[PDB]
Design a protein around this ligand. Structure first.
Ligand SMILES: *Cc1c(COP(=O)(O)O)cnc(C)c1O
Ligand SMILES: *Cc1c(COP(=O)(O)O)cnc(C)c1O
Lengths: 755, 755, 189, 189
């Protein structure tokens, strides 16, 4: 038990107050309470801004000057952001406190202690009971149950065989490994223990309680806890939603696990094509692609769906937000899509936090409270380890029940289908805690901080870009709205000059309006998508606002390599874009290290520092290519290549018309099983059918899926692979990653169904 | 760093040796080495029989008396059981040690230190160097890489969002959680870090190195580390092996994950029927059920496979060992089954340790050294968390490549289909450590200890049974051979009287020989199956050797409940059988607690203690049923029920002939997706196609799989459910579990396909 | 939690036995268990004839001499006169103990620890478990229930007015009175 | 690892700044970092004029008075004369530091810590990480490699015969000589 005691600076002159507080702190030590003593409200505010966990706040209070009243409000306000239920003791004057007694006081203060008129032991006893009560309600229901149960549980005569870790201790390596992870991970790793705890696969007991909690917090009718990631989540939903008799509508921006659902169900796919901009960033699917008549036509025209014309699609999937933080107006999206399908699945894997900050209002599935069952059935999936706080593999299926709803009995057969009979309860616990953190005041507080940090980073870089540009020198710039408007005044600000409170709280600062050139999504309708403040792309010069390469530029590839030599690995990297991921796990000011490294890159680029000094692992690993070359020399050679080969346009061509779907993904998968596939060299790809998906980076969405034909000898899909290969060949050490290829002696191969 | 120094008691009279060793110990302390000082070989033996991890052993050695020579061999032999590579320093006499110089001496001793002729610092220095060498080779490849890499890794700008656990610390619940688990779990929870570690899904870098190590240790051509249990391992293998064009042969004793594979692939199944015994325990599939013409016939006559007569099945699976510890002679099983199928899948989920003890020789898939590809392709699956040492969800697919082998490019598409793109590296790390523990001497030592403990518990029980029997009183008895043979003599023993070294090392003692009535598997051929010593079933009295209930009996359900009140949970409980799982995690002598609790049961049973005293929770909850009864009263009532209802006969009838397969399990699963299913009450079950599998406990194997008909009015399956249901109604608190049922107001229901 | 460990004098010549028991006593102390060490059966007898309440008896046992077999019977018999359900640990030799295995041995011994073949921590953990189970069953049902309920009970807005003794503390006489009788009297009232 | 922390005399009135810096000091100690605490720029200037090697400099900064701006330029300029790549942490005010953000600020400051809004452990971890990176680039190529290699090196079976100095210790005169010059001279031979 930790108590924070703030002595008000407005009473230091009344020394007897200090004496009385010391007597109380003494009484608290005697009962084994850890006592933190603060001598000003400001010291207290700062302690409460740290991650210091306390069980009780006590404070003294003169109650005369207006500045103190405010200090009190601020203090208890700060406490209650992330420590919402902590009990507050006023160590006050009876007369003054009772004169001031009203709803506002009681909102602030939970317990009253007349410091100059009571016994220290009495107050301390009351403080211990309050702290006990607080601690008893602190932990979420699954984590709490697992913990309690493991204190009584007999680890013998059942699996797991290690028996709360004892197995590992039996060899030195096992023992070292055991002590490195500590016992509690092993103690809470118990097998199915029902009447005690319940079952994950049955959704009973404390596992059930945890799922109900999750639903209340995330605004779903029902939530399913998953230990196989959003991979297992997506496989589950799709198993439950479609058979090989069904037509389905699939976002071309879909995860591998969406394709896996196709392969596992045998369903008949039609694809919604997303936009893109000059940076190779994938934008939203436009409203036009979601119109019921657009969908009807795709179905009628497609070789996979023709013979099922006019059949109602059983499932529809959209990825929201995208990898680069394009967030759809899901409320608008639902309206169009539900005119086609009764089952809507928004794959929100990177986006579980959205509900808990007003800035995302309307741009996610679980808006407001659930309960209105008139409308379609909606699934949202979260990888809670992505941008909530949880262990890898932790995941949720969130469900709003509507038309075409699927009851527990039916859906749980799909759940079990993709589950394990022996789940690791450490994962489930982290999933339970993930929810706790978003519950009440803290959900807002945690999300606001990520937004705040990302914005400070964004403004800093806008400011620096502006500064450098006035000296006729180049710099990186953030990818976000350039000119912003305060909606109360009518006042306009460039991004750098904007009040940060406007940027961090007003949605309109992020909305992609038509006519704004920054987003680069040509003819996007208004009020359709926004940019997530926390997905911060940074743009190296080289791409012009018209969508053509400039006379000079700085290739991100070289910047990403420089960054890496400092541990820093951006999540994504195009030709000029570099995306940095801000989360609830980031600490304040940490972005300052990004700036420092981008500045040091700039200083070396301009000095043209020999690669032997700045990138020695590159130079000694490829002596011939990079000897006698500086960093600017390499930027230059890399930019020449971009100019000569126009990969951006190659890209766009490869993504404009979908390749012809010859067979379904399942059918194409089955070719593998039938040993009826072979590795085809790049130059032989035209006319061959992909045995697996092909996902180039960039744009990091599928170019082909399994079962699609590469096309004729004029194939843009094959030619885009040609350019990636060429870049790889010309700049060793800077190779692209393409999912679904095999490189043989530097030559690209894809697995294809036999002739 | 830890040194054990054993001062030979044959030199205590030479007090200068003591002085010289103490000068060494001091010098070691100055180099920050922890020194454990032992003053006899016996003390040293004891220390080395604990889980104490030492980095160096040093000992003095008079080298005159045969007893000391023996003590030395015993000491070093003991060290090297579980601490095989620990350096051994002889603190010796130069002249005597060098006169003794031969290969036997150099096998015992790594380093020679002339303790009365050297400087203590020089010896300390060489000891520190040796200990460093030992510690640098100690850890398996992946755990080591993860550990090293987390020390330098940048947790920012990368998912997972918590960044080495930092995110959790920001709310008080989340901090409690973080600190309960400790930071290292979170610090090794990194996302794909490609050039540093490699990838699980790509099988590269440290991950691939770990799999090659696992394959070497486990005798495979190749291993696949899995983070989704054997559930996921199984789905992978089947996904790789079959389409809806294939016939497949399936052990009717199959895990839910096998059915899942059938439902995911759409393949056409035919079943091999396992034997069974008077106790309700499932036995092995007899060789006749695996004969080429037997299977060819099964196919010919099956509704699901009729029109695919004379197709080679593309896969065949057998569960080995069974839940209760029945192990197949996999050598002979393979010989038969390879005549039908080129792919053999042995599901060894409960059986990962078998290769590392001679007692199991020939009764597991990965026998001797891999290399010969003139044979079938064989898969073995291990749930490494089950009876190896590993966190839940950790699993391996071990493969021997033969005819019909699936290469890497093909198999890995099946791998990913069932994977997650975000694996918890904690799980992987424990899978790497499970391998380490089984590598070399320690594999033998660990598995031998489990066998030794289980045999001690068995022998104690056999003795007690014999003693109580001789006294005209009843007792529990172990389910194992009655009479045993020393094959080196021909001498004969009661299990109870047999030398334990015979029972713990000689396989013939566990073999189920034709005619032997202990096992109960009528007309089983010789050299076909054995019992695993470590799966200990205890048998309560009541079932006669002729397979008919006796005149009295103690129902096991009563015993299981009494064990609950002491926090002992058997993994399996039938009518008269109680199974206790022994593993590498159990500590020595722990079985004694089982004997104490079973004894106290007997004591209360014979005294007919009021249920109010000994089962108060039960009396509290159903006061009307268990009012004014003793424990013996209730056992009598339960036994009367068994006599009247004869559940064993119903079990046997329900398992004699397979239910008719109307549709494949996939086709049936699809009926759920179409909303074409309903909850059907017990009496309306005849005529109905089951939409999910039904697994009653006992015998704990599917009575029906998805798509099978319950049968006509006479249906034995339905009558079996009836008596399960009847038991429950008669004995509230002792309810059976049945997977795939729903119980509504006490009436069993099963989801079936609509008529 | 309190353990009495009795080292058989029939084994003082085997110094490694005392070494292994020392590591066990150390491991128990690390778990906040009070350890009483006794170096002979007679000493153990005398301790057990005092009003000394213990939660576990551990003893070593050569199992060779009839005089020792008798000492063991006498020691555990004494334990169980007034401390009937105190769990008993044989810190034993595996082979000799398992050879002697029968109903008489089991009335003497609840738990087996192969003192020369096991990790001290493992044995210590099993003793703590057994001692916890012992203490949970120790107290008769009303006293036990009063004790438990007082630890979670709200002494306010309820008679008696003294409220777990607080009322008495308000004058020096009442306060002297309160401290003299102690809080538990007032708290169970 | 040695950190110098300069507490600007311009903030001594804001006593809460001092409290927060103390929490950071203690967090740094707990990570076994040596903390030199300086309570004025002038004291800071002097320490940096001595031959004191530090792996990180942290300072507070009110950012109002022209005298302080100069103090900061002078302290950091001094640091970087002879300790050029020492990481500098500003223990600063977010609003003010970020209103002042520009190339000039970035030449002075490598790392930003909002001292009144952050956890002491998060800042200490970031400091340790920066000091680790500094030490790894600190030494020149050959002395670095010699130093590293001598640690893993087998002195035996080749020349010099002294084998990292052990030879010298075998007579009293040689051992005197050996301990006089210390072992590293011989180990790098
Ligand atoms: C990562 C991701 C998934 C898969 O989640 P895992 O938790 O990695 O299995 C599914 N959909 C999207 C959009 C993702 O980004
Ligand atoms: C438990 C088990 C499985 C499934 O393994 P999990 O690790 O629980 O996914 C598969 N087959 C058998 C025989 C099993 O016992």
């Amino acid at each position: 038990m930790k108590v924070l005691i703030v002595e008000s600076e407005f009473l230091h002159q009344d020394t007897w107050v200090g004496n009385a507080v010391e007597r109380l702190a003494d009484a608290l030590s005697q009962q084994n309470v850890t006592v933190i003593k603060s001598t000003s409200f400001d010291d207290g505010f700062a302690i409460l801004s740290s991650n210091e966990a306390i069980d009780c706040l006590m404070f003294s209070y003169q109650m005369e000057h207006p500045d103190e009243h405010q200090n009190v409000r601020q203090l208890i306000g700060k406490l209650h952001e992330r420590q919402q239920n902590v009990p507050v003791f006023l160590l006050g004057d009876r007369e003054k406190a009772l004169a001031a007694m009203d709803r506002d006081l009681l909102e602030l203060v939970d317990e009253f202690a007349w410091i100059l008129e009571d016994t220290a032991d009495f107050i301390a006893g009351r403080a211990v009971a309050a702290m006990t009560r607080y601690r008893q309600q602190l932990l979420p229901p699954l984590f709490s149950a697992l913990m309690k149960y493991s204190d009584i549980h007999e680890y013998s005569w059942a699996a797991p065989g290690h028996q709360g870790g004892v197995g590992f201790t039996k060899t030195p390596a096992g023992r070292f490994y055991h002590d490195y992870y500590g016992e509690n991970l092993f103690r809470t790793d118990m097998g199915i223990e029902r009447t005690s705890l319940g079952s994950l696969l049955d959704h009973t007991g404390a596992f059930g309680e945890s799922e109900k909690y999750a639903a209340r917090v995330f605004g779903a009718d029902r939530s399913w806890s998953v230990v196989v990631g959003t991979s297992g989540s997506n496989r589950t939903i799709m198993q439950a939603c479609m058979t090989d008799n069904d037509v389905v509508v699939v976002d071309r921006n879909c995860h591998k696990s969406i394709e896996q659902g196709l392969m596992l169900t045998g369903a008949k796919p039609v694809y919604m094509v997303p936009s893109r901009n000059r940076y190779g960033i994938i934008g939203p699917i436009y409203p036009q692609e979601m119109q019921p008549e657009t969908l009807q036509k795709k179905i009628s025209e497609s070789p996979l769906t023709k013979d099922k014309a006019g059949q109602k699609p059983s499932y529809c999937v959209v990825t929201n937000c995208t990898y680069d933080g394009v967030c759809y107006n899901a409320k608008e999206a639902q309206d169009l899509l539900e005119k086609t399908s009764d089952r809507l699945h928004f794959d929100e894997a990177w986006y579980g936090y959205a509900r808990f900050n007003p800035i995302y209002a309307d741009h996610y599935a679980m808006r407001g409270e659930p309960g209105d069952h008139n409308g379609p059935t909606v699934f949202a999936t979260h990888s809670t380890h992505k941008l909530l706080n949880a262990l890898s593999q932790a995941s949720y299926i969130h469900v709003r029940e509507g038309r075409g709803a699927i009851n527990f009995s039916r859906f749980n057969q799909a759940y079990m289908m993709h589950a394990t009979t022996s789940p690791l309860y450490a994962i489930c616990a982290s999933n339970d805690v993930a929810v706790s953190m978003m519950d009440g005041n803290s959900g807002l507080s945690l999300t606001q901080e990520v937004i705040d940090e990302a914005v400070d980073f964004r403004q800093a870089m806008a400011r620096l870009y502006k500064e450098f540009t006035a000296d006729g020198s180049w710099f990186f710039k953030p990818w976000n709205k350039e000119v912003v408007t305060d909606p109360q005044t009518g006042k306009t600000y460039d991004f750098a000059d904007a009040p940060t409170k406007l940027l961090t709280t007003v949605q309109d600062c992020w909305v992609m309006h038509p006519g704004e050139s920054w987003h680069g999504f040509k003819d996007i309708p208004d009020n359709w998508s926004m940019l997530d403040p926390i997905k911060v792309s940074i743009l190296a010069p080289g791409m012009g606002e018209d969508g053509e390469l400039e006379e000079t530029g700085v290739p991100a590839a070289l910047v990403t390599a420089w960054l890496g030599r400092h541990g820093i690995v951006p999540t994504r990297t195009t030709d000029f874009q570099i995306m940095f991921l801000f989360s609830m796990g980031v600490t304040r000011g940490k972005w300052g290290t990004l700036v420092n490294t981008l500045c040091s890159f700039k200083r070396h680029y301009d000095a043209n520092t020999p690669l032997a000094q700045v990138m020695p692992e590159l130079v000694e690993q490829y002596p011939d290519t990079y000897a006698n070359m500086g960093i600017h020399d390499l930027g230059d050679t890399m930019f020449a290549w971009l100019k000569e080969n126009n990969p951006g346009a190659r890209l766009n061509e490869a993504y404009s018309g979908l390749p012809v779907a010859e067979v379904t993904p399942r059918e194409a998968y089955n070719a593998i099983v039938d040993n009826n596939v072979e590795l085809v060299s790049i130059e032989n790809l035209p006319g061959r059918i992909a045995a697996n998906s092909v996902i180039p980076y960039p744009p990091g969405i599928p170019m082909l899926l399994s079962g699609e034909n590469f096309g004729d000898k004029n194939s843009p899909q094959v030619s885009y692979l040609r350019s990636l290969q060429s870049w790889d060949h010309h700049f060793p050490g800077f190779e692209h990653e393409t999912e679904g290829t095999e490189i043989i002696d530097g030559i690209y191969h894809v697995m294809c169904v036999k002739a």
